[PDB]
Antibody
Framework: EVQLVQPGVELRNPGASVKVSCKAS????????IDWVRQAPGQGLEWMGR????????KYAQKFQGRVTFTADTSTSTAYVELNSLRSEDTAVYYC????????????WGQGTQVTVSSASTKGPSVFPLAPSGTAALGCLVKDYFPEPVTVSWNSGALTSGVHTFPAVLQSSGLYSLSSVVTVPSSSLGTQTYICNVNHKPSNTKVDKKVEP | LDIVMTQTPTSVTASAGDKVTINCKSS????????????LAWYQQRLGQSPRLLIY???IRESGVPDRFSGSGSATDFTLTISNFQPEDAAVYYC?????????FGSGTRLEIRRTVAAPSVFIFPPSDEQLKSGTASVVCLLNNFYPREAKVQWKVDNALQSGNSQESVTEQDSKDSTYSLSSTLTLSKADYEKHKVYACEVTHQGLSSPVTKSFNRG
């Protein structure tokens, strides 16, 4: 239907400035104001401010006034958030939500754009199969990567039932490691082909590992 | 001013079918005198997902939202009510005001679910030949669809208990069956892995009468 497409993630060093974007597929601009809500890890939602795309009318919650800026371009139907003097505190998920004019907000929301404030270098992952040996379990090991996240899909997204993509863990190396599994019937092992698609946009890595018995 | 949203309780646990109630109180009236409309909205957030609007105008249901979800209350006291609480309804619930600037959300309220004790289906995976190439060996242990969350895993290399070389991660509760899944990974240098034959994973859960053990021989 209507889609508020934001990027998946950006990593900046401390003091550098980011620009969270939000493409509004739709539906269509305008006559739908836009606001920015942020979600720090495990903590609730925090209201940052609004925008009138009609003609860039803005409001900021005191605590965001001075460090944030919301721009909007009527041409590409894209709205922005520019946070300055980035601190490790600013590490959160930045939401682009569409404000309905009566009953306030937020019928359609955006995917989230995790922002990581870190001095560390990008690193692509290493994809290894987890081989099966009347329900068998097979998987993928997405080892040694930075930063989070990685998107793991099975059979180009066609396989969804019983898929378990585990929460990533921090190794002693400071690199994340993840594992994605799927329970399948033992009968389909000879018939069906199982291939995990692994994506890591920060390092521009795209792997398709075929899991064999 | 600056309205404040207060959610009660902070967390809830209920059986499949029982009636669930979440209360939200605002420091100032969010009802607009002339249109006699309460500026209150309820949202359902799940892990790794954007919040989802359920109730708006304090009592109006959104298109495609189950009938079980119901909005009520007026002026300051508002209540989200799930009647036939289902496994899908295990998520975080937030109340949001729209009456004045800045906009305010609630602290959130975690709803949970109770289920029959489910034993884990245990699986063991040896390291791949390509992972070996580069002097590392990671051994994965799978604890598929189990309840409660509480469980014990023990690595036994050549029947000798391992300590300080493993790491585990647990999934959130399932939307369909309401179970958990656990992954423990034993990481050794190629030289240490090449030293031993047997690799065992010992699982202790209340759904299991005796500790289940899955093992393998290197080559």
């Amino acid at each position: 239907e209507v889609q508020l497409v934001q990027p998946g993630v950006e990593l900046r060093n401390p003091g550098a400035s980011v620009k969270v974007s939000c493409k509004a597929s739709g539906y269509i601009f305008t006559m739908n104001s836009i606001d920015w809500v942020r979600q720090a890890p495990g903590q609730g939602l925090e209201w940052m401010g609004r925008i009138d795309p009609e003609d860039g009318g803005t409001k900021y919650a005191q605590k965001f006034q001075g460090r944030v800026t919301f721009t909007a371009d009527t041409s590409t139907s894209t709205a922005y958030v520019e946070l300055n003097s980035l601190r490790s505190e600013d590490t959160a998920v930045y939401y682009c939500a569409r404000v309905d004019d009566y009953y306030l907000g937020y019928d359609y929301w955006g995917q989230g754009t995790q922002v990581t404030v870190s001095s560390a270098s990008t690193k692509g992952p290493s994809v290894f199969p987890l081989a099966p040996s009347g329900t068998a379990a097979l998987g993928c090991l997405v080892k040694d990567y930075f930063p989070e996240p990685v998107t793991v899909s099975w059979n180009s997204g066609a396989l969804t039932s019983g898929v378990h993509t585990f929460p990533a863990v921090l190794q002693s190396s400071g690199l994340y490691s993840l594992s994605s599994v799927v329970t399948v019937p033992s009968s389909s092992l000879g018939t069906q082909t199982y291939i995990c698609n692994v994506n890591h946009k920060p390092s521009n890595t795209k792997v398709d590992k075929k899991v064999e018995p | 001013l600056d309205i404040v949203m207060t959610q009660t309780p902070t967390s809830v646990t209920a059986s499949a079918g029982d009636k669930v109630t979440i209360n939200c109180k605002s420091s100032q009236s969010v009802l607009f005198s002339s249109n006699q409309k309460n500026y209150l909205a309820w949202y359902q957030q799940r892990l790794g997902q954007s919040p989802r609007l359920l109730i708006y105008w304090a009592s109006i249901r959104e298109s495609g939202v189950p009938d079980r979800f119901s909005g009520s209350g007026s002026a300051t006291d508002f209540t989200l009510t799930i009647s036939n609480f289902q496994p899908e309804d295990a998520a975080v619930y937030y109340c949001q005001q729209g009456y004045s600037f800045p906009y305010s959300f609630g602290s959130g309220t975690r709803l949970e679910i109770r289920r029959t004790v489910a034993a884990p289906s245990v699986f063991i995976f040896p390291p791949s030949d390509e992972q070996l190439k580069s002097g590392t060996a990671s051994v994965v242990c799978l604890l598929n669809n189990f309840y409660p969350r509480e469980a014990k895993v023990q690595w036994k290399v050549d029947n000798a208990l391992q300590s300080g070389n493993s790491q585990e991660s647990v999934t959130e509760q399932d939307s369909k069956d309401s179970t958990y899944s656990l992954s423990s990974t034993l990481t050794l240098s190629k030289a240490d892995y090449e030293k031993h034959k047997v690799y065992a994973c010992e699982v202790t859960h209340q759904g299991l009468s005796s500790p289940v053990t899955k093992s393998f021989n290197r080559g």
